[model samples]
Target chain A: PTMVSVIKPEMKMRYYMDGSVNGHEFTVEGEGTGRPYEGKQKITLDVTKGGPLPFAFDLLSTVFNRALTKYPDDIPDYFKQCFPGGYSWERKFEFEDGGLAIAKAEISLKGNCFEHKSTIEGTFPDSSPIMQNKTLGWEPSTEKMTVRDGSMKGDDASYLKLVGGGNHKCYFTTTYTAKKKIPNLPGSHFIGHRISSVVEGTKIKVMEDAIAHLYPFNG
Target chain B: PTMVSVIKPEMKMRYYMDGSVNGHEFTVEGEGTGRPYEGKQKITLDVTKGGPLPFAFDLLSTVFNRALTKYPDDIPDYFKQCFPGGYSWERKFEFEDGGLAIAKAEISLKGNCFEHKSTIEGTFPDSSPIMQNKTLGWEPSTEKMTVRDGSMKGDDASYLKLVGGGNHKCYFTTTYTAKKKIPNLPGSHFIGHRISSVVEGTKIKVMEDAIAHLYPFNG
Candidate 1:
């Protein structure tokens, strides 16, 4: 018989991040629903008591969103070879004002992708005083960092967009507005920086609904 | 710092069994909630459409319940060394006449036991005509098989009890009665056999709340 696709329609995802941020330990955990080949996803994360704010608030909804929602367009070759095993990776982020954060994650699933888990651990940085104050008031703002080439800092730094939708030219936009003001430049700490814009030569899509062999005779 | 016990209070458990019974392929999948050290659990399983009856019906509720609910009193020694890995096992059953079934299972859990999966596969036997008929009517009867010295057949075959509760003398009992009748016995084709009973020297408990190292500073 010819091969066929077995649709699960819906799957559950549970993940948790635990480690330290600016020397403070904390955890962020949540569960959500997932669908195959879908760009839009519904995910939620909770920062436990004493978790570093502003940074984690943004991490949950921004930085980590791709890992949580996007399926890898071409899952690592090793992952395919391992069939029913796990994959691990790490990422680092450098903020403009000397802030640094590192995140390490390991995700595992069966061939069918009906069930999976992502366990993350990392040491993050607390946001600037201004952002932390806003998080305290619950007015968390969306953060956008533009990077030129592969550099997340320096003159080449710029922004990126959502990846992996069938509409190749389409990208998600998170409009950011200046919610606070900057003080007069003392040519030092009081100075603010201007952002730049650029685009990559190719619009790369990194996610797709993971596929697996479908046999006709096993329920 | 002195060691302390940290509790998660609640956890989620998901498992599925896929295989053939009596030449018919089927799948049984389910999800449920679990608590630390609790014998009573909330679990639900759904046998896919076209699954064999009477046999699958009794297997889900009666035979497979322990694997889904119970925690090993002492997790495998190798499991402890593996830190974060999986464990596997297999079980077989023989009916009074000539029916036989085998279940092979592989269970994987992280060190914390916060996330885990149990993948099971096995071939089972279809019940007798009477039992299959009752299953079709949605009035499946409970099945009990007691074995003597590991043999599931012959005159020594008998019953067992639920293990692992703190109350040593306590055991769970599932009542069963005839829902239908038998016709004339040809002493061969039309004959029904009577069941026997026995007990073991030790009330061995196989399950307990899985425990892991409790660090003071996570979440």
Candidate 2:
């Protein structure tokens, strides 16, 4: 008789930090794996003074651009939309003396079915000893993006938002999914996807409640 | 009103290593309080070989010579008298190379309680590692001295013992005290100050037992 051996598969997501901003530079590398995703991906973000930039933007852009070049319309509309406010963005900039740079931008988007808003802030090349020291600060330039999504039928739709930071000049990516469908929209196909949207305020409230409960015995 | 503080004295003792047929080396340094005898004394011992030798002759000779110089015509009759059938000793010296040198000597008392013994064995340097390695034979060297007492009976007798290896030497000095009075001896007046006339076997036995007990526990 022969015995059979079983092998389990392993999955991981890898992120690489690259890029410099305001004369300061740092790199991040991480690997994580979960049920749905089984591969790793790495991207580098470079930042400079005057604003924050999204490292994820560069990574996803590279991927989407390559895909768009290869398949044209096959690229998803979900990615083609720019930040809502029509804010202009600069690419490939450098800063000297390694100080903090702040970049602020607002994006506004509107459609009969949905509306969304996005605000981005970038800080890079922070060289203060307090920020650069090994023990205390030493964090990479970060990008913070806040996004809000809503539906035309405000009562029926829910809003979603996200904020994230990256070290040094790296890019930070934020994703928001609406919690409800716009009742007057022309397309019925969006129902399922819209209903699946996660509500940002509710999630944040739940997280805050969790933290409060955890420290209830303290004070 | 004055307050008194309680204080405790520290314990102290001289430390020595076990001498076995196999050569070994050790160093020790110590400090103590006392006066004349009050101050501290420090010594070191290294033994390269352990097999028997005519050490009793050389050891006695050294003691006798020192005593004669310190107090002439006061040597004890027992020490001055030769051992019955004369004294014969056999010693087997083993070097690090596994080569052996055997020394057998006969001891006789010359006129005036003086004793001399002939030593014939492998030619080995007292402190030559190279000679030991090249000759592949053993050389036993003595180098340790400790003052056991301030005075000696019969004569200014003191005990000398060999310790250490081919590298370092130590002599343990033990002052001899006579248990009984020898009236005719010129040094008889010092008898009360002396503790014993002959060598005590207890100390050597204690050392031997300690070595035996300790060696098995170490690598």
Candidate 3:
């Protein structure tokens, strides 16, 4: 098998910030692009702009946290130091704005699983809006082929899941909850049921193993 | 290596969005904690916070960029479908206050970096206005150490830097710039002033390769 994706997608990010600077109280937003290799992933925020925008100690916490949580560890203490506690030999400003503004940001994480929570009360991924958007107007569709005679139907979902392995051999897995529909006819009718026509559906649990990394890397 | 921490710190996040129950215009800010591993590390945002922060596409990018950048190759096209283009996601919640109210929030970032700006602003290590109120009017202090009394006066700094290498081996490097003050008779003093005491300073480059891991890990 060939490694196919970015090894440490977490490392793949681009920082972008912009907003209305009123000097008095301006709200600006910044967006970081996820790695093209790992797939476009990013973090967008509404922040009151400032110089150097302090560092997010938990910046690269997720990926590392999984390993931290999945193992015999307490989110390596050294990692915290490497991040929040100046990982520096000296604090010297060699150039203009060289002074690293270390701002304090509160990021609560589940020690069992290093992570934070959204303080807001709305579901971000509830696709109800998309299905309801006036622009769309319709429940679109998923591309799938049915029987040529229009008798059988098959459905599938593909996901490139990272299998539990080491970066050395980065393995991944995916579950294609495939489905197939079979047609039947009994020459009978009940309510709207065509006595001579019927449809049957079934779902299958199909999980496949996979791997990541088409190139070389070190986290 | 074992998953020592949150694999997907992002995934480690819970989508919690709650403001004006009436679904009016309300902004609630929450803070993410610095790694307890990192200690009382946090920036108590004044988060007004992370939504399901609707997961941003460009989550992590730096490390991945390095490889994609360093390697003379084209990233897979599938990856394109993965990032950039439309940071095109929407935020909409249908509920009580039934409908979701949206606000114009702004955020800015250091663009060149993937993260939305230095997530930290104002004062992280900054004084807690309330706790430190009237604590002291003096220039607090830039968290750091200095070279005290010494004939050599060899001041040093320590750093724990993440070095590019195997994700599993997880290599790191540190620097200790130790200097010694050498007192010598001033020969120039004999010419213009007087040959007195002198102090000579020098820098040292000490690189040590280090690795980290617990039970299971990929990169």
Task: Give candidate 2 regions above 4 Å deviation.
Answer: A1-219, B1-85, B113-117, B123-219
lDDT of each: 0.30, 0.21, 0.17
Query: Lowest lDDT 10-mer window, candidate 1 chain B?
Result: B184-193
What's candidate 1's DockQ score? Answer: 0.00
Full candidate order by lDDT, most accurate first: 1, 2, 3
**Best candidate according to TM-score:** 1
Predict model 2's lDDT versus the native. Answer: 0.21
State TM-scores per candidate.
0.26, 0.15, 0.15
Candidate 3 positional error at B214, Å: 23
**Candidate 3: residue A129 lDDT (0-100):** 23
What are the per-residue Cα lDDT tens digits for candidate 2 across B36-79? 11111112222223423213212211211111111123233322
Candidate 3 scores an fnat of 0.00
- Of the pair 1 and 3, which is ahead by TM-score? 1
In angstroms, give how far residue A77 of model 2 lies from its true place: 78
